[PDB]
């Protein structure tokens, strides 16, 4: 949450560029235990309903336990969003990092489309990874040491054209979605930065740290042979797969508590009107 | 300008982020013809005075032209920044994609921070070509069709690594900032995505057509070898100067009024504090 966005940001949005004043009726798709509307709910009109969609049985019932304790009206369904019935119609339909593991994005963003009312809203919060990884700076070490564009950028078209996943699908959702007739389409980078502060000397230099870490963020690469035998499985040739271990390895023995990284996740966020 | 960043995201920055309420003094090193004055002053607070700083004569000439129009108090200042001795402290020092053309980027923000009294706030605006370059999506092509991030970060490195000009030095900032001492350092990602969209027929849309021309977007790459000599003598292969001019051969092809795309300069707005 704190990592990808910035909570002046989200009410910047909320409040000056989408405006919403009146509470709002949304659906959020692949809510997982319910992260959007943790982010969003606090920001909304007070009355907002939040309805979130998963077929995570255990992540809906940390969901339900979580926002149990908290003061906003929500409900979850547990169902496929691809195959799922609703009988009502929102005032926003949104996902956050969704549509990433869709085989037929644009199907899907269709259906979100059609659950919402006219006049209604659609915001999709996508991220963009090779933005997101082409947006590290480390002091004491050059990008290209730690981070192979070159080879993420072959990588992640290649598991696109296989499966269909697009992990670069945040800067493609204006287009879906001026196909499928949205209208007033627009789309903003979230304007999060993390700073790992090499001089900053405080509890919250360190939990920042330990956020990075959880991520994922410079994870061991593990074994050698099968890292590389996984990449090439994916449609990379032997030198590609060689060179992003040795990157991947670099920023393991590189990124430490004591470092100065500077990281943008990138996110995507896109949001258009339905024809009234 | 309106093709770098959202007018209202600005005002998000001016008025909820940095909070500015009373008038200030504001200097802005290499102004050029006055950009960053022509948008901040018009967010600032009434009676805020403005101050640019060039070497550029003629730049000068056509900056004190356009701002003899405005209702604003401007005065600009012809000299090399990187020696002028200001006697006066500001509110706030700031510059717009001017430190990457510097040889010596920390000296030139040490300077600008003496600039600033106690208290005061220092602003830049920086480019980060490498994530500006990784965030461009043209619908009906591959993005490793038509920009090779694995050479443009190699190239990028390489450049900095002769004359000191760093094309990517917007990520950096905020490490030139915290070695100097500043205080509450914070860095955020202009949330501008520029769509060019297939399906908008309209004199808004061939405008933005025109900006992103003229803005030397998707260029003719000109004389093959020319270009693959000149790269080659910036630090790269001949097969990388080679795949660097196929790309950007196939972007000037490939984009066109009837294009959809999307993309996001990610310019990196730098800010922190002068202890006081
Ligand atoms: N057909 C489908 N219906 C519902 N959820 C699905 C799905 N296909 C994949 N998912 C899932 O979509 C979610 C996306 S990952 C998490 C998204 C959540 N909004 C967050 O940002 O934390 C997962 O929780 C997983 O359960
Ligand atoms: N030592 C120096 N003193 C003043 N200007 C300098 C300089 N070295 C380079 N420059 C210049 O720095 C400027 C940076 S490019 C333009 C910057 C302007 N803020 C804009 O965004 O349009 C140029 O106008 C050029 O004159």
């Given at each position: 949450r704190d990592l990808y966005y910035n909570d002046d940001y989200v009410?910047?949005?909320?409040?000056?560029?989408?405006?919403?004043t009146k509470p709002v009726h949304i659906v959020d798709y692949g809510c997982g235990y319910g992260y959007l509307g943790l982010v969003l709910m606090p920001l909304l009109p007070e009355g907002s309903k939040y309805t979130?969609?998963?077929?995570?049985?255990?992540?809906?019932?940390?969901?339900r336990e979580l926002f149990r304790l908290l003061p906003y009206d929500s409900e979850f369904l547990?169902?496929?969003?691809?195959?799922?019935?609703?009988?009502?119609?929102?005032?926003?339909?949104?996902?956050?990092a969704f549509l990433l593991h869709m085989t037929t994005p644009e199907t899907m963003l269709q259906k979100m489309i059609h659950s919402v009312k006219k006049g209604g809203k659609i915001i999709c919060f996508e991220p963009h990874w090779i933005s997101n990884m082409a947006?590290?700076?480390?002091?004491?070490?050059?990008?290209?040491e730690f981070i192979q564009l070159?080879?993420?950028?072959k990588l992640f078209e290649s598991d696109t054209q296989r499966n269909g996943k697009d992990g670069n699908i945040g800067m493609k959702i204006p287009i879906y979605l001026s196909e499928l007739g949205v209208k007033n389409i627009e789309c903003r980078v979230s304007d999060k930065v993390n700073f790992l502060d090499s001089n900053m000397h405080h509890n919250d230099k360190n939990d920042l740290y330990q956020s990075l870490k959880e991520e994922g963020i410079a994870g061991d690469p593990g074994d050698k042979q099968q890292?590389?035998?996984?990449?090439?499985?994916?449609?990379?040739?032997?030198?590609?797969?060689?060179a992003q271990y040795?990157?991947?390895?670099?920023?393991?023995?590189?990124?430490?508590?004591?470092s100065s990284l500077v990281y943008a996740p990138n996110?995507?966020?896109?949001?258009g009107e339905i024809e009234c």
């Open positions: 009410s910047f949005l909320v409040n000056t560029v989408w405006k919403i979130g969609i998963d077929s995570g049985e255990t992540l809906l019932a940390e969901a547990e169902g496929d969003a691809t195959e799922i019935e609703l009988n009502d119609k929102y005032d926003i339909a949104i996902c956050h947006s590290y700076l480390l002091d004491g070490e050059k990008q290209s070159g080879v993420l950028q890292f590389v035998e996984r990449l090439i499985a994916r449609g990379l040739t032997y030198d590609n797969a060689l040795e990157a991947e390895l670099r920023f393991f023995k590189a990124l430490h508590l004591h996110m995507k966020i896109t949001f």
